[PDB]
Amino acid sequence: MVRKMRIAVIDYDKCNPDKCGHFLCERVCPVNRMGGEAIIIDEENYKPIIQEASCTGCGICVHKCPFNAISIVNLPEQLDEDCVHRYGVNAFVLYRLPIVKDGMVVGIVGPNGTGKTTAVKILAGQLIPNLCEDNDSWDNVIRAFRGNELQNYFERLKNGEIRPVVKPQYVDLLPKAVKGKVRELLKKVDEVGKFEEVVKELELENVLDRELHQLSGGELQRVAIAAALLRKAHFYFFDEPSSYLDIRQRLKVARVIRRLANEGKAVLVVEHDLAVLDYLSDVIHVVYGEPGVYGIFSKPKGTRNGINEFLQGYLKDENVRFRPYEIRFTKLSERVDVERETLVEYPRLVKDYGSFKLEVEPGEIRKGEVIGIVGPNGIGKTTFVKMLAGVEEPTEGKVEWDLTVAYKPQYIKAEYEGTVYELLSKIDSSKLNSNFYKTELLKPLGIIDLYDRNVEDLSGGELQRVAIAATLLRDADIYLLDEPSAYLDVEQRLAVSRAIRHLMEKNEKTALVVEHDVLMIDYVSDRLIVFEGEPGRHGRALPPMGMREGMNRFLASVGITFRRDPDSGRPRANKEGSVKDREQKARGEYYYA
Ligand code: SF4
Ligand code: SF4
């Protein structure tokens, strides 16, 4: 086998055409000698340029450079030969692997279906690498990764003195597979003798009484986090633990997972929220490719640089573009925030089931804006949303008016016979066929390619995108999405953000997006509803307020302050106990866009 790209980098800060004659390059260059364009002259910025499309990689120019402003490398037997696994010809292929490490938290960021999960099975002893050949042994794996830390992994893995435990990419499998209580389960799975510490730090002592099927999202997720650590294993691989956790939970779970590094145990993590990712990890991997054709894991990076580079879409270590535009964000000074017309107003409501109490203070709904809902789970974010939605009748007050409400529920389960196209089509055929919904909603969330399978025959992340798109293609005055964040990746999360923002702004309509992922809030929100009280008991919904004034108000009850990163612009979470943490909290401004 073979395969090879040439990559040329010239440290211009070291080049000086006038000192080496006249671009010693083009002169000494064999290809240019025979009438070729390996090295071209930028007779303006006065620099030399190597057109890697030519350069034989002979390296003559490199040896000649009177300084050493030239490097030419052949990505041979390293990027093409590395090839790890092929599922048979005309089928998915993996290149490279994430490099897990002891005593450290190895991060992963990169869109779904790029064989994140392919690598897990590989590492779990349950799939032998063929190295895109025909192999069915460990030994060729151990050799191929010679010069690297993963050889040592495959040697232990085969002796079988390590076995990694894996928190699966979809959960909601344990309730329909394991019956009885969270109390029970957590005794059973116990083998680590750390039962006390776990259940307490992740605050599942109230959550023991309920049965698995009676859990809400945040709780079910965390109970999996618990049961994975109580199984005995050195290596713990968490695939998407950000699903359905609220803002308060996800920051607290991050601390729990981070404390593992100190115990010297190896954590491998997928996260799709940059603030949570920054905080946990110590290494970071970027994974690039178009889903379902190939995936390649990049070289290990230090968390901060790795994230910067993801945002830029350009790899300077690997020389790969993988997205033709940059990840970007919206402050509050990059907008027009001007007042708009009142759609409706709601008085004081108060709903008591008699197993939770909510009071909603008097509030205004404006037209043409996007209101983010924030707070910890079971604080009746959902109780409010459901009162306008019509599935719950307020005990007192009125919200149920002649606005039509479009409602995306918290769980997703399908009950629909027929295709993705049937399901959408009966709502508004018309919308499907117009160019806007095609630029902003349907096309970048993959739905054009999804019309051929049934709704029941769609998987969690595709089906999520399908629910979301469905709710926004309903004909309504006001759009209600309860927690769409679940099972979306970074790119998806962002695409849904740009779609919500454009569609709502253009037709001047209201939407409520209950939200907990920092980035979506950071882009989309015009106004905020902060929830407080003590969850599972009482909640007090405070009236709508400005985006900044809201995230300020709320962040102060979490102890956790947010900056603006200076490298390429993203929400920077600041470590509890830091300079910035201390300066923000002292000065009553607990947040910056
Ligand atoms: S070799 Fe490339 S870098 Fe060294 S001087 Fe000539 S042009 Fe500038
Ligand atoms: S061989 Fe080395 S120098 Fe000659 S072209 Fe290819 S890269 Fe540039």
Side-chain angles (χ1 to χ4, degrees):
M1 297 183 277
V2 274
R3 212 162 177 169
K4 221 151 194 169
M5 197 160 172
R6 255 135 273 265
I7 288 183
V9 165
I10 298 172
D11 178 338
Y12 293 100
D13 213 297
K14 292 190 287 192
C15 159
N16 185 169
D18 292 299
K19 194 164 177 183
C20 69
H22 198 49
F23 295 77
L24 192 51
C25 302
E26 177 230 2
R27 192 191 307 159
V28 169
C29 181
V31 174
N32 289 33
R33 280 177 157 153
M34 282 164 244
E37 287 179 298
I39 300 173
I40 277 182
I41 314 186
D42 175 358
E43 295 159 301
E44 187 184 66
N45 287 296
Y46 212 56
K47 325 130 52 184
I49 298 187
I50 299 172
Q51 285 186 172
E52 306 172 358
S54 300
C55 169
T56 71
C58 79
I60 297 175
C61 68
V62 194
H63 288 295
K64 258 50 196 164
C65 185
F67 306 96
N68 204 59
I70 300 180
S71 293
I72 291 283
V73 302
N74 274 99
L75 304 207
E77 269 66 14
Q78 146 253 325
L79 125 73
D80 225 296
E81 241 24 74
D82 238 20
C83 209
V84 167
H85 180 241
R86 187 170 194 95
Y87 266 92
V89 277
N90 281 228
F92 189 62
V93 70
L94 210 67
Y95 297 110
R96 299 194 157 167
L97 276 169
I99 293 147
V100 282
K101 305 196 179 188
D102 289 307
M104 291 172 195
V105 185
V106 178
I108 321 177
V109 55
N112 289 320
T114 55
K116 302 181 286 97
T117 333
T118 306
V120 168
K121 292 174 277 79
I122 281 165
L123 305 161
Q126 309 155 358
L127 216 60
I128 314 167
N130 42 308
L131 307 171
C132 316
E133 280 161 10
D134 49 78
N135 181 252
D136 41 63
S137 73
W138 298 103
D139 296 312
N140 298 33
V141 187
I142 289 156
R143 289 178 75 70
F145 281 117
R146 192 175 50 166
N148 208 29
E149 70 174 280
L150 280 166
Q151 66 199 117
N152 193 45
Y153 186 89
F154 286 113
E155 291 275 48
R156 296 178 289 183
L157 177 69
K158 73 165 179 187
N159 294 108
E161 69 186 1
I162 44 183
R163 53 181 179 69
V165 154
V166 186
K167 199 282 309 181
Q169 185 176 269
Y170 297 102
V171 303
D172 293 73
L173 289 176
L174 302 155
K176 43 178 186 185
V178 180
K179 300 293 184 289
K181 301 303 184 160
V182 170
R183 197 166 189 102
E184 292 184 316
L185 183 57
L186 297 173
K187 307 161 174 171
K188 203 196 57 60
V189 167
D190 194 57
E191 302 204 291
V192 293
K194 197 174 63 158
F195 180 35
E196 291 312 285
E197 198 199 308
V198 174
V199 172
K200 173 189 215 52
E201 73 202 303
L202 289 174
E203 308 163 59
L204 315 175
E205 304 181 68
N206 300 111
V207 173
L208 304 181
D209 288 325
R210 276 180 301 301
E211 205 176 2
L212 294 147
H213 293 97
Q214 290 184 102
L215 302 173
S216 52
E219 301 176 26
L220 185 36
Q221 188 54 247
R222 282 198 302 188
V223 169
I225 303 290
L229 297 178
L230 301 182
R231 195 56 88 214
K232 182 56 184 176
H234 186 64
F235 272 95
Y236 302 109
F237 305 158
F238 296 91
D239 284 21
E240 311 182 69
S242 188
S243 308
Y244 314 105
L245 299 181
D246 39 281
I247 183 51
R248 193 83 63 82
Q249 284 185 190
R250 64 185 48 192
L251 297 163
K252 281 188 297 187
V253 163
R255 296 187 196 168
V256 172
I257 301 172
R258 194 169 176 195
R259 291 179 274 183
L260 299 153
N262 290 295
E263 305 181 64
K265 300 183 270 183
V267 181
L268 171 68
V269 72
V270 181
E271 287 303 301
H272 302 307
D273 186 54
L274 312 169
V276 184
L277 187 55
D278 193 38
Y279 199 82
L280 277 162
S281 291
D282 299 291
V283 188
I284 182 160
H285 275 59
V286 162
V287 203
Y288 63 83
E290 175 189 317
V293 177
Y294 69 108
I296 316 198
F297 311 82
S298 61
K299 322 187 173 167
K301 289 164 188 67
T303 315
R304 189 180 72 78
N305 301 281
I307 299 192
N308 296 328
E309 299 183 66
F310 187 59
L311 317 182
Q312 287 176 250
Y314 178 62
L315 292 183
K316 324 184 182 187
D317 303 71
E318 199 53 56
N319 295 8
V320 178
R321 253 286 175 168
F322 69 75
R323 173 180 313 99
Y325 50 90
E326 309 175 56
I327 302 180
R328 71 173 180 193
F329 292 98
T330 302
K331 289 158 185 39
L332 198 76
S333 296
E334 312 167 23
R335 297 177 196 262
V336 166
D337 292 302
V338 82
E339 301 293 323
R340 301 206 183 167
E341 301 179 349
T342 306
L343 185 59
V344 63
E345 180 175 73
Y346 48 99
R348 183 184 170 170
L349 300 101
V350 171
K351 171 45 184 172
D352 189 19
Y353 305 82
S355 58
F356 179 62
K357 185 159 176 184
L358 176 62
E359 68 165 61
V360 188
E361 296 309 291
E364 160 187 285
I365 280 274
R366 285 166 51 217
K367 181 187 46 59
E369 63 162 25
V370 184
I371 310 196
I373 302 172
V374 297
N377 277 15
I379 205 77
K381 298 181 289 88
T382 307
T383 298
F384 178 55
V385 181
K386 291 196 299 170
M387 279 200 278
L388 188 54
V391 287
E392 182 54 92
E393 178 170 68
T395 311
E396 296 198 320
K398 61 177 170 67
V399 278
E400 284 178 28
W401 302 287
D402 302 75
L403 300 222
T404 316
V405 289
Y407 176 76
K408 208 282 304 172
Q410 177 182 1
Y411 279 81
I412 202 69
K413 167 181 180 64
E415 205 90 31
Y416 196 65
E417 194 61 83
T419 53
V420 173
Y421 199 80
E422 286 188 65
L423 192 50
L424 302 166
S425 63
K426 67 198 176 74
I427 301 178
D428 266 299
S429 183
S430 298
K431 301 187 181 192
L432 293 173
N433 300 335
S434 190
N435 192 250
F436 205 71
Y437 306 75
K438 284 181 187 190
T439 313
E440 288 297 327
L441 181 52
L442 308 176
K443 306 175 168 265
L445 309 171
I447 326 201
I448 304 299
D449 293 294
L450 286 169
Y451 288 155
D452 60 287
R453 296 296 307 200
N454 296 96
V455 182
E456 315 184 16
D457 299 288
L458 257 38
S459 42
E462 276 169 26
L463 188 59
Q464 182 62 214
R465 293 179 305 177
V466 155
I468 301 171
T471 313
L472 303 182
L473 283 160
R474 300 170 185 184
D475 202 62
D477 290 289
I478 179 155
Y479 290 80
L480 309 172
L481 303 90
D482 197 5
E483 302 172 68
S485 300
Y487 304 110
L488 294 175
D489 71 77
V490 64
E491 185 62 10
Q492 300 170 343
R493 269 163 175 176
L494 296 159
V496 169
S497 292
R498 182 188 191 254
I500 300 173
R501 171 74 174 275
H502 289 50
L503 183 71
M504 289 301 137
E505 189 202 290
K506 195 51 176 302
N507 60 23
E508 299 190 64
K509 285 289 179 52
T510 312
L512 280 59
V513 201
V514 170
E515 266 306 321
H516 299 290
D517 181 68
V518 190
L519 309 165
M520 188 96 67
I521 294 154
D522 185 60
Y523 195 82
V524 306
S525 298
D526 290 303
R527 286 207 295 203
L528 227 104
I529 320 184
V530 160
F531 276 67
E532 294 296 312
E534 293 176 309
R537 295 180 185 175
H538 70 284
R540 176 167 193 197
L542 280 161
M545 76 294 284
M547 198 281 288
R548 192 167 74 88
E549 202 178 277
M551 296 307 288
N552 297 125
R553 188 64 68 254
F554 180 71
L555 273 155
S557 293
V558 192
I560 297 290
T561 39
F562 271 78
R563 207 225 279 156
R564 174 68 180 209
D565 197 57
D567 297 309
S568 53
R570 46 168 182 109
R572 168 56 193 283
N574 308 114
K575 276 58 180 189
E576 189 177 286
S578 61
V579 163
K580 295 303 173 79
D581 180 83
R582 280 176 201 281
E583 283 182 74
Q584 286 198 22
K585 287 179 77 167
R587 308 168 184 185
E589 279 188 70
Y590 298 100
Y591 181 66
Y592 283 115

